[model samples]
Target: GSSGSSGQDSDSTAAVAVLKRAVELDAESRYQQALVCYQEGIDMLLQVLKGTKESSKRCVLRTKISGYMDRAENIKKYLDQEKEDGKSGPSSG
Candidate 1:
């Protein structure tokens, strides 16, 4: 977790962009890709938030985290359903 403003902010911005893409994919029912994006974005945000000292920023990050967590849960549920239905079975390779 870097302390400098530029580094943290850059990472945060990138995370936000990734999350935005995740949301778009989620809307399109592209659950697999969206799940990957969500995981990456959430990890990046957590890394930035680790050293964040400001209350406002922390609050905002918390809100985003909650939203992403909810979406993650929903995506997992759908994926599990898909697997059970044989739509997303394990690869033979």
Candidate 2:
């Protein structure tokens, strides 16, 4: 046997199993702890950014992160608070 390693994507291994539940559950009514895996989903989505090596991959990851950001963005509105911490979001040119 042989071993050929690539980027630091070993952690994405867990995100899939979780997605199997998160996507299906969150995709449903999502009126309960259904949003549980969302945070988990973004967790590994972050992992992907850390492992990005190619421009193509990075571009793809950008969309993925944007999608999660949309969901997370909506959730943030659902459960939000005042401003104490900064640099979380909103970037200007």
Candidate 3:
């Protein structure tokens, strides 16, 4: 998330773009930057749904939010797991 796509109308496409950027940053050993990207992407996606008008549109947006939320959850879990792994050996399982 370059803070470029973290805007009012950044729909799922923008979110995906940010997520991809996040992974790229992560692969570059930029986990903190990547996490920020993940977080901002999630926030943008949530805003997309939160600002919805129509009920049906709201439903669709909620579905979209749910998908993003799932991804956010996974990212959180992965981060925690990685942190734990860093703190302990594989035997710490």
Best by TM-score: 1
**lDDT of candidate 1 over 2-89, digit per residue (tens):** 6754653477777887898999999898987788788778888888778788899888887787778789778988887776667444
Predicted candidate 3, C-alpha RMSD: 6.7
Model 2 clashing residue pairs (backbone) = none
RMSD of each: 6.3, 10.9, 6.7
Candidate 1, TM-score vs. the true structure? 0.76
lDDT (tens digit, per residue) of candidate 3 on 7-79: 6553666777786787787688666567777677767767876777889978876775565566556767777
For model 3, name the residue pairs that clash: none
lDDT of 2: 0.60
Q: What overall lDDT goes with each candidate model?
A: 0.80, 0.60, 0.70
Judged by lDDT, which candidate is best?
1
lDDT of 3 at 7: 60
